[PDB]
Design a protein around this ligand. Structure first.
Ligand SMILES: Nc1nc2c(ncn2[C@@H]2O[C@H](COP(=O)(O)OP(=O)(O)O)[C@@H](O)[C@H]2O)c(=O)[nH]1
Ligand SMILES: Nc1nc2c(ncn2[C@@H]2O[C@H](COP(=O)(O)OP(=O)(O)O)[C@@H](O)[C@H]2O)c(=O)[nH]1
Ligand SMILES: [Mg+2]
Ligand SMILES: [Mg+2]
Lengths: 356, 385
């Protein structure tokens, strides 16, 4: 049965931890649980920076989120912050659990809160008019009341049907980041790496994207050492041979890809979290014009940072939306994670939020 | 064709993982390995020796002569645990020393651990010679490394020391690549090929003893090394005076076999032996091949709380249980000069005196147990007579 990564977002005390427990009983504290047609991994962080860092750099990468909103309070500023963040890091779908409905029985009051949640979701670019809003009480559900346990079921039905099962890596357009390039004596040039997505077979055309102008060629070999010939797929460590390609023609940090499926860019917006000293970062802040290294897949490229209008610095442990201009193009899409390094220290973790 | 377990040891940041990557890439260019990404060897997965977590990378490659399984580990604590209780004993090690820093404290500790766990042979890769062209400084570092090896009884005058650059080799610079070849020739030549378990002298730890009507007195266990068949002479070694007798049969699933082999779970029937003459914790062995001892030195890793172990230190005179193969035996610990207290998570050398003898030899692993939990993992480093 398919697996999906999700979690709970929304303002402090609105009920994420209780909902999380009520869901598990019915049917960064990780839990797993399953529905009839799907298995779930579920994250519930204890507030503040924990959400920021799981969402920018976490073990999972959320395929959808449950926004918890307390009927008693309405949307608060962390409700907004979390919706904004979700958009920034690429969370593809949101279902809402309107919680604490045991405390608010005026239907008219519930519809007010509902209207405002939808508007707030639509003010980022989520489709506020189509997102499921399930009325409930995680507390009364956890406490066994059949009335409210039923709505945990309704929530999980809405999760099953509205948050699609993510596209499997093997079904995506071929992509292999080039790890190294060398000549095998008596043979020729190979480009090695671990296939990230899709499938490749001898005779396929690929593009070599990033660092230099894109070129297209044909795959003349795919090898997994002493195990496999002619094909590879997501997860495989392979050497790829390419028609007409010498060592001067392919390098570490480029990618092999299905033609047209990914483009090179030098300029993008990203959401970045600045590591603390204790996390391995520096104690000093980011600033406009800072020119660290950006690590995207298998290479690192210098880039210049610009901070938002009227932000002069960003302190360790904080996050911001930054604009970046790289000195060389790199293959990239929205939602791609990267590290920011300077010297031998990881100073930042990012996700590409928009391509310019 | 012959298979050999090796690995890279040495102080943090000296270049172990970059060397490991460089070897795989060098041999990959000759169709003799899979080239392995530095970051995949560096970010080593977790392995799980019973409540103990060890971050361990495995690569494989071959030279003209042998197949190598090569281990590399991110942190000093991983090497501690790997060497004392990791899944593969090393048949040899490559000691990486930065020519820019010289020997450092993990350089010493790893040479010391290699000695304590019985690593047969060390070859040295004097790394980062791209940073150091002063011929005075090089020969100084090599003399220090040689002295340090000799201090722990390695043949510091015989040991090969290859001057290279892991980083330049990994980048493809031909002259540095040559030094990877020089290293692999030193590995092939100086690290001996280990004996196979089946060619070693028969040994089986006794698990249980009972009588089978119409067959005789049977000692069960799993054959560890060698082979056994009806008519062979065996000794019964440990816990009481050694006795020699004839194997009268070997059974598996209640049926008589032609022979039992390294790996088989068998019952060995023993001539002239009653059920009280043999017990759990004794070993059956090729006569003369193993001796019983009560006193030994060991290198011991003391588990943390989190691994299931103690939550307080122990002291000189600690008298726990020592679990050798199939049975616990009480022993008294004497700590070395200068060592007064041992904390959860420490590794130390100790002397032990058991209350009954056990068949043992240098290299034999054991657990230290107390109140039915494992508190330590040890290797017998020296027998004391
Ligand atoms: N009345 C009511 N209280 C709830 C409900 N769900 C949670 N709470 C309570 O509100 C407080 C905050 O809940 P919690 O799950 O920790 O909030 P979090 O900060 O979003 O994880 C706790 O006292 C909960 O027991 C509910 O459905 N109804
Ligand atoms: N200049 C130079 N640097 C090296 C060489 N070998 C490794 N390094 C660098 O030293 C650092 C540590 O190497 P690493 O292989 O991870 O050391 P390990 O902890 O012993 O695994 C890295 O920055 C390497 O790229 C070398 O031969 N020359
Ligand atoms: Mg909570
Ligand atoms: Mg390393």
């Amino acid at each position: 049965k398919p697996h999906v990564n999700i979690g709970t977002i929304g303002h402090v005390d609105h009920g994420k931890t209780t909902l999380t427990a009520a869901i598990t009983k019915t049917l960064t504290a990780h839990v797993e649980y399953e529905t009839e047609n799907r298995h779930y991994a579920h994250v519930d962080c204890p507030g503040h920076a924990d959400y920021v860092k799981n969402m920018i750099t976490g073990a999972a990468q959320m395929d959808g989120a449950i926004l918890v909103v307390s009927a008693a309070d309405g949307p608060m500023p962390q409700t907004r912050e979390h919706i904004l963040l979700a958009r920034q890091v690429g969370v593809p779908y949101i279902v809402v659990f309107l919680n604490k409905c045991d405390m608010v029985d005026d239907e008219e009051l519930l519809e007010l809160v509902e209207m405002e949640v939808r508007e707030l979701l639509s003010e980022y670019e989520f489709p506020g008019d189509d997102i499921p809003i399930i009325r409930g009480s995680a507390l009364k559900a956890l406490e066994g009341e059949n009335e409210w346990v039923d709505k945990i079921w309704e929530l999980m039905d809405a999760v099953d049907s509205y948050i699609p099962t993510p596209e499997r890596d093997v079904d995506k357009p071929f992509l292999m980041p080039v790890e190294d390039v060398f000549t095998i004596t008596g043979r020729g040039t190979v480009a090695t790496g671990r296939v990230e997505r899709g499938t490749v077979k001898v005779g396929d055309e690929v593009e070599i994207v990033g660092l230099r102008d894109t070129r297209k060629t044909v795959v003349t070999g795919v090898e997994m050492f002493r195990k496999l010939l002619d094909e590879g797929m997501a997860g495989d460590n392979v050497g790829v041979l390419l028609r007409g390609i010498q060592r001067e023609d392919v390098e570490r940090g480029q990618v092999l890809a299905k033609p047209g499926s990914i483009k090179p860019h030098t300029k993008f917006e990203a959401e970045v979290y600045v590591l603390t000293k204790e996390e391995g970062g520096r104690h000093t802040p980011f600033f406009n014009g800072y020119r660290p290294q950006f690590y995207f897949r298998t290479t690192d490229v210098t880039g210049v940072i610009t901070l938002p209008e009227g932000v002069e610095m960003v302190m360790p442990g904080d996050n911001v939306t930054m604009t970046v201009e790289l000195i060389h193009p790199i293959a990239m899409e929205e939602g791609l994670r990267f590290a920011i390094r300077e010297g031998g220290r990881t100073v930042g973790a990012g996700v590409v939020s928009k391509i310019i």
